Design a protein around this ligand. Structure first.
Ligand SMILES: Nc1nc2c(ncn2[C@H]2C[C@H](O)[C@@H](COP(=O)(O)OP(=O)(O)OP(=O)(O)O)O2)c(=O)[nH]1
Ligand SMILES: [Ca+2]
Ligand SMILES: [Ca+2]
Ligand SMILES: [Ca+2]
Length: 342
DNA sequence: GGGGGAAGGACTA
DNA sequence: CATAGTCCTTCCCCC
């Protein structure tokens, strides 16, 4: 089996560099202004000309202007990028019916067939890269290996605008060298709980009893790690389905009065119903972010689908239930519709 | 004992 | 200090 992973270089930043080629070369930062105080919000992402100076996704926007008070700051237009991605994805299918759109910029193509072996899959990696650059003007990195985890890892650093193959013997090299923290699915929380057990690498997983991995990171996370470390890992490329939609908005100021939070919450529901589009959710969830950046949520599953009116009166209830259970003020409020039916 | 759901939060990207 | 999923642990109901 040979898996080819595609990941578009600084997607949001690059797409904006395309709709206005004049932005190329200079530092570009796609932000997310909440308004709390003008330049409130964080950075969605930033082209590499800006990342070299510390500016990047996650950091507050004000802390970004302090570094590059001359970088072009653009508001995130997620819908434009979502359509460039779709175009670009309905283009990969032309290289394999075995495709999986993991993210808005990440896709996996199973090309165990179309191809030969590496030397060829690699050459199929260059056909895709160039076809994408020609047709949509986007540069992307490509990863090729026995499975997805490694295909995705390979992408790691071939990035940006690169390509890299990880042959079987390289696999059994990283399984012992690559840092456990740079393995897909291992966020700081998990990666940390691992250094606390002595497992600083992937091969160290086979040295510890399964009852302690299942007790720490959980079964699924433990099996996953072990299989990968054993070289037995492979999962298939399966098409994925949207399992939940939502929109969480930022209030101008913290609050705890229902009537003041209503408006914001109702926009979340409205804009969320627009995003559902023909999907009929049977479960509803109202999510809140307390004044001290903590997340609290309440939901309810109905024996049937939810209508716009139902959602309205239901969110209100779950919200009252929230403000009652928690004492803190609310900074952000949103909704999440799931359990569709189709 | 255990399957079957549902709820709420933990964790990742 | 700005969207979602899979996992996950706990709880409740009942054969
Ligand atoms: N809204 C939002 N979007 C993010 C955030 N982090 C990443 N994204 C977007 C940035 C890209 O458009 C897309 C892919 O993210 P990646 O982590 O793979 O990096 P990115 O694509 O920005 O550039 P790269 O892969 O380094 O060339 O997801 C974030 O913190 N907030
Ligand atoms: Ca990317
Ligand atoms: Ca990504
Ligand atoms: Ca990582």
């Amino acid at each position: 089996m040979i898996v080819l992973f595609v990941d578009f270089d600084y997607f949001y930043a690059q797409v904006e560099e395309v709709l206005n080629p004049s932005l190329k070369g200079k530092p570009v930062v796609v932000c997310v202004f909440s308004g709390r105080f003008e330049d409130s919000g964080a950075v969605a992402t930033a082209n590499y000309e800006a990342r070299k100076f510390g500016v990047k996704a996650g950091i507050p926007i004000v802390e970004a202007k302090k570094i590059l008070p001359n970088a072009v700051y653009l508001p995130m237009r997620k819908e434009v990028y979502q359509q460039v991605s779709s175009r670009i994805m309905n283009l990969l299918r032309e290289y394999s019916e075995k495709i999986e759109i993991a993210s808005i910029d990440e896709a996996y193509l199973d090309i165990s067939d179309k191809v030969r072996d590496y030397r060829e899959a690699y050459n199929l990696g260059l056909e895709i890269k160039n076809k994408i650059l020609e047709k949509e003007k986007i540069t992307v990195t490509v990863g090729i290996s026995k499975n997805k985890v490694f295909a995705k890892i390979a992408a790691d650093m071939a990035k940006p605008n690169g390509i890299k193959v990880i042959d079987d013997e390289e696999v059994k090299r990283l399984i012992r060298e690559l840092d456990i923290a740079d393995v897909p699915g291992i966020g700081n929380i998990t990666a940390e709980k691992l250094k606390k057990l002595g497992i600083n690498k992937l091969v160290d997983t086979l040295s510890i009893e399964f009852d302690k991995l299942k007790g720490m990171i959980g079964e699924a996370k433990a099996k996953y790690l072990i299989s990968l470390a054993r070289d037995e890992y492979n999962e298939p490329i399966r098409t994925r389905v949207r399992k939940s939609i939502g929109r969480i908005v930022t209030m101008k100021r913290n609050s705890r009065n229902l009537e003041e939070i209503k408006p914001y919450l109702f926009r979340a529901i409205e804009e969320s119903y627009y995003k559902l589009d023909k999907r009929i959710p049977k479960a509803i969830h109202v999510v809140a972010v307390t004044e001290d950046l903590d997340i609290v949520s309440r939901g309810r599953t109905f024996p049937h689908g939810i209508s716009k009116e139902t959602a309205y009166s239901e969110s209100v209830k779950l919200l009252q239930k929230i403000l009652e259970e928690d004492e803190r003020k609310i900074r952000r409020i949103g909704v999440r519709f799931s359990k569709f039916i189709e």
